[PDB]
Write the structure tokens for this entry.
Amino acid sequence: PVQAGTRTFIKELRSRVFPSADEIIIKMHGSQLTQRYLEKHGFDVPIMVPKLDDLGLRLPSPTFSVMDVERYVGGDKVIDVIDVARQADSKMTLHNYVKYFMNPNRPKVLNVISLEFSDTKMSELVEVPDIAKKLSWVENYWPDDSVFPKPFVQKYCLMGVQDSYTDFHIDFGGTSVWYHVLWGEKIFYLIKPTDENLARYESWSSSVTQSEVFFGDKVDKCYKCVVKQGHTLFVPTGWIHAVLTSQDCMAFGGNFLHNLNIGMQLRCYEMEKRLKTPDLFKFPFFEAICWFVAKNLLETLKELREDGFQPQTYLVQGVKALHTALKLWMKKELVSEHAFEIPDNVRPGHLIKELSKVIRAIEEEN
Ligand SMILES: O=C(O)CCC(=O)C(=O)O
Ligand SMILES: [Cl-]
Ligand code: NI
């Protein structure tokens, strides 16, 4: 049995020719990637931005080394590290990983994909794509006065050696991402969130054979997307993807929720609940933000109805979806474990009704 992350498994991965991600991804320039665009055409396929022009993406020169990270962040920090051959989580000092990295003669393949650096000297050196900041629920709807700490998941630094591999997952909470390769090369394997595929993914995720079964074989199309130095990949809600670090690589990235695919975001959250994913501890107060969002989304639909206007499709879909999930989390039987995410401001039962009544009309009123 070929085990994931092992050199044998890597020979096969490097051998398969996959349908090109050119079949589905949209290439565009910095300046085309706007809220306006995405509201009209949707954000349902990865968007590749070959040049970083007009993204608002500010980051270190292409020479920024693993050693420079160690400085700005602090070698003392204890970071998560993947033993790729074992597909398990390890810990070590940033200082050591840099030693391990800096030396050829790597006795094993070790990846760093989760090193969030907002609260460090290094943060000053990085500004995320304007588009991620424009869409992000944290940027738009997180009150300056809640008890829940603000999630910091916008600035990640990724260092990985050749043959680092991450297996097929859906990002925590169903968040979208951007990734930028500073040097080296990453290769994403991408799988559309059809229902066939999601379901198959939940199955595979809770099969004990998971690490012996390449989930790419289980779906009709698994798209290969090679992200080279200086390019910028944007992956939308729910997309199932694996990643291969084909060359020693440093990348930057960030995660964010937004209003476009609220339904898929919820589906993904409720699925990660079912699977008990530790990933979900990176966005602990997903539910809280959802409440804050339903407030704002309600207000917008109230303004459109009070003036005879018709709301865009994605807003009706999303609101209906929020409504279903707030209602679920409030059921008397489930309510004991959701109640703590209920922000002090919002009024659970009231809000849910105001949503119910708004969603009637729109339906019938259309
Ligand atoms: O580059 C990697 O190995 C994985 C990137 C990614 O998909 C993640 O960390 O969530
Ligand atoms: Cl967000
Ligand atoms: Ni990912």
